[PDB]
Amino acid sequence: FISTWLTAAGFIHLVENSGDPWENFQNNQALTYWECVYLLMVTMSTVGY
Amino acid sequence: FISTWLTAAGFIHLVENSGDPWENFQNNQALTYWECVYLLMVTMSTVGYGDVYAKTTLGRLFMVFFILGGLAMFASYVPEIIELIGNRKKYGGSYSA
Amino acid sequence: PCDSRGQRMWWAFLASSMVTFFGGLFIILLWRTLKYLWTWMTSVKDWAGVMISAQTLTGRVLVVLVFALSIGALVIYFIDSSNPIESCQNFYKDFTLQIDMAFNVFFLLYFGLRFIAANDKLWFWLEVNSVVDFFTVPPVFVSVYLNRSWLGLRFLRALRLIQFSEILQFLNILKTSNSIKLVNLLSIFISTWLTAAGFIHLVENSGDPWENFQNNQALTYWECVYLLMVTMSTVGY
Amino acid sequence: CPEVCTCVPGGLASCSALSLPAVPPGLSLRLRALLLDHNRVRALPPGAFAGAGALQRLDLRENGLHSVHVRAFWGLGALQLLDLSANQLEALAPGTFAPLRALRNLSLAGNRLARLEPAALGALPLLRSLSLQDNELAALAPGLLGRLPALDALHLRGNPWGCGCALRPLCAWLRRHPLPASEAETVLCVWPGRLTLSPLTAFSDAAFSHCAQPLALRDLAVVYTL
Amino acid sequence: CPEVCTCVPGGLASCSALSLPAVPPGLSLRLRALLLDHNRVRALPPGAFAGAGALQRLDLRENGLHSVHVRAFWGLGALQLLDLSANQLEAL
Secondary structure, X not given: OHHHHHHHHHXXXXXXXXXXXXXXXXXXXXXXXXXXXXXXXXXXXXXXX | OHHHHHHHHHHHHHHHHOOOHHHOOOOOOOOOHHHXXXXXXXXXXXXXXXXXXXXXXXXXXXXXXXXXXXXXXXXXXXHHHHHHHOOOOOOOOOOOO | OOOOOOOOOOHHHHHHHHHHHHHHHHHHHHHHHHHHHHOOHHHXXXXXXXXXXXXXXHHHHHHHHHXXXXXXXHHHHHXXXXXXXXXXXXXXXXXXXXXXXXXXHHHHHHHHHHHHHOOOHHHHHOOHHHHHHHOOHHHHHHHHHXXXXXXXXXXXXXXXXXXXXXXXXXXXXXXXXXXXXXXXXXXXXXXXXXXHHHHHHHHHHOOOHHHOOOOOOOOOHHHHHHHHHHHHOOOOO | OOOOOOOOOOOEOOOOOOOOOOOOOOOOOOEXXXXXXXXXXXXXXXXXXXXXXXXXXXXXXXXXXXXXXXXXXOOOOOOOEXXXXXXXXXXXXXXXXXXXXXXXXXXXXXXXXXOOOHHHHOOOOOOOEEEEEOOOOOOOOHHHHXXXXXXXXXXXXXXXXXXXXXXXXXXXXXXXXXXXXXXXXXXXXXXXXXXXXXXXXXXXXXXXXXXXXXXXXXXXXXXXXX | OOOOOOOOOOOOOXXXXXXXXXXXXXXXXXXXXXXXXXXXXXXXXXXHHHHXXXXXOEEEXXXXXXXXXXXXXXXXXXXXXXXXXXXXXXXX
8 A cells, every 4th residue: 555655656746747748848737745645645535625 | 433523623723723833833724613624524525625625734644644544434434323323113103092 | 667686584484484383393292291191083084094095086186286296396496496595576477476376275285184194293293294394385375475585495395205105105106115115215315415405505595694694605506406416426526 | 294295384284286106294283184186195004194183174186095994094083074086995994984073074976885884984973965976886775874864965976876675775865855956967777677767866755666664563473473 | 068178169079188087077968079088987887978968979088998888878879979999898
């Protein structure tokens, strides 16, 4: 559980802080790793704030 | 259930009404205790409206750790309490001569 | 000439409903206490009981009328919910109110007949159908008397949908266990969904009583139905 | 008294047409009857006129005011003339006019007030007249008119009203005495339906309509027992 | 004839550059060819032209109106000219 949570949070962090390649890395979102951990925890429990 | 609900709501109220210690208490969010009770009730049921939510690091951390377990508590308690209330025998009367 | 609404009064309808409920409850309790240590009726009771169930052709006619008129009352509630919560409407112009008059007169007569047929009057008083009869008909009579309309506890009409399973069982339409269970579940679910949506609509289109009604949120009844459906399924957009 | 505005012979007073986004400084008791025209005073701080012991006329013409403090007029004490017209105020702060007990004259012309609070206005028992010309307000609470005992004349030119219950007090006030001084001063009442149109001068005073009686006991007895 | 503006003998014409955000009071049917210049009002007040029964033209000079009301134009009807120049209208 911990490994899946942390790895998913890290992947979200890497994807969001960097952008989308077809967009010239312009569509980015400055998300902290802690914020990504929180987002994965909210998503995985079907809360979805 | 009631005691833990009220305690979690009180902790969220305390954390949100007084900001993070490392932010010099400038990150505070004015929340009435009733609003925090509503927030905890919404979170426990996995609804997540998003109209009201925690914003101050400690609040989010407590929300994460509460999601890890209070949700299971709610899911395993509320149907059980509902079942323990409806246990009644319908034909309990006496014939009227 | 199609004027607007001004002064807001709503305690008349609610007060009339609360009187009709609590006064009858207190009279029943007082009669019971007086009977306690002295501190042809069967014939008419049996006739009313036969009338309530579809035992006679007139009984089946009454049951089918109850079904159809409960559906019609729910539809009329929808139409009135499309209107503003508090309005002034003269009796003789709008054709909706005469239809509501006939529906409520029929429901009042049906309630009286059911009370005549009831075994225990006190437990009959505390019935969901009896309660929704208490909080719906006196408000309609007060509204037609005062020539002004308030969207009060009219969502309770949806609670009349619970008795559909018993209505069908009387008419010898439902016989199997699976069909009976399906009808029960569907009727209960629809009734509670619509009642919750109506209560939310009433509480949201008006404000908090202590806030001078300044917290009003413009929510259509369909929007409240959508909100309740989203909430019940733990989606929460 | 103000350095920018030349001192007026006799009693000191402010200058007209002053160009000054800054409030006139050096206010004192000798300074009376301030006149401000086409200035840019964004807000009035609390106790703004405390330096001036007593004032007679205050005229805020063509000045952009978007926020007035509740205690901005603590200093006035016994002000007589004050016109609040052609201003940018969105709403009056509660208790703003409470110190203005001696305010004889006040006019509200062209103020974009959505609704003015009767508590903010205060009693103002010594009010000669008022105006409601070209104001954005469309509904007047009965308490607003009922609070002022000695109000005499109210100007409603250029501000058509919406027919309904909100009109019932005002026309009743019109029933007490005629507001239109001349036939050219008459205004018409707007209706929600475009088919119907009516002038307020042709509108009957205290005319019967729906909800004529806000409360009664004869019907109260029957609605409690029907 | 407007109160502040000069009364022109014969054919009445409004004074240019009135610098009044609100419409002049005392409008009459004899008054014609109103000229509203430098109106600071964001919106046209309803029934503003109701004082004057009939006109022939209407000109706005450096007037910015973000919105107008239907009752504002009721008092007109006999006009053959209407100018809203450099206005800030967005919706009608």
